[PDB]
């Protein structure tokens with residue numbers, strides 16, 4: 001209700017199951033939601049172009065992650081294409097949604113990880129997309145970016161994701177980081193492709209809980225940081241809503257996401273996929 005009027009459709013199990021399989025209603029509902037995209041002219045900062053994968057997919061100013069070191073007063077140094085994202089119940093800064101780093105933003109991305117104390121990164125890029133959708137921003141073993149030693153301590157190979165256990169060191173303080181590289185993102189978002197995404201969501205929220213009180217923001221990224229990123233975060237919020245309230249409101253969750261970052265859940269097929277994932281989870285909980 002701050003940047004646009006929020007919409008809601010509270011779904012119980014039966015309606016959730018049926019809604020997932022009604023593409024005609026899904027498209028009518030989806031295309032009524034404002035994208036809440038930022039006018040590109042909002043960001044006329046010299047050199048900004050080089051920091052963006054897509055010139056029209058920009059962070060909404062009110063929720064933008066600003067890089068406060070080494071110059072908070074420099075519009076370029078402080079810029080990253082990223083937004084703080086509210087979680088379930090409107091909890092502030094549960095996630096940060098960001099574009100997949102490009103060659104020129106690899107160091108900015110690690111500046112953001114350190115500033116935010118981020119304990120978990122969720123990367124939604126398939127292996128054959130590693131060309132123009134994400135740069136390999138992590139090292140094979142070790143790399144230093146702006147006084148911070150990043151060490152890949154272990155690679156855990158699973159069916160649907162690669163988990164990297166990363167160490168971050170600067171001076172005397174050392175931090176842990178979990179990097180979830182999901183490699184099972186489907187082109188055809190049929191119900192049979194929903195289980196790996198659901199598994200990833202469950203694993204990440206459990207790892208988030210294990211960080212203990214006041215978990216620092218969880219970074220989530222895909223190419224533009226809105227489509228797949230939007231799905232992941234909406235699914236994560238709705239799983240907590242279903243467990244707490246016994247209902248799901250994908251519509252209201254999508255509206256809340258869009259208020260934080262324009263275009264979250266970019267396509268109708270992504271919107272339906274979220275319904276397939278939530279319908280699947282509801283059946284699993286029911287046992």
Ligand SMILES: O=P(O)(O)[C@H](O)c1ccc(-c2cccc([C@H](O)c3ccc(Cl)c(Cl)c3)c2)cc1
Nearest residue numbers: 126128129183184185186187188193227228267
């Ligand atoms: O960004 P999106 O809007 O979602 C857009 O639809 C979209 C979704 C996926 C892809 C994509 C990219 C590379 C390789 C593949 C593989 O063909 C593949 C991999 C894993 C699985 Cl599990 C499957 Cl089924 C199929 C798919 C491209 C574009």
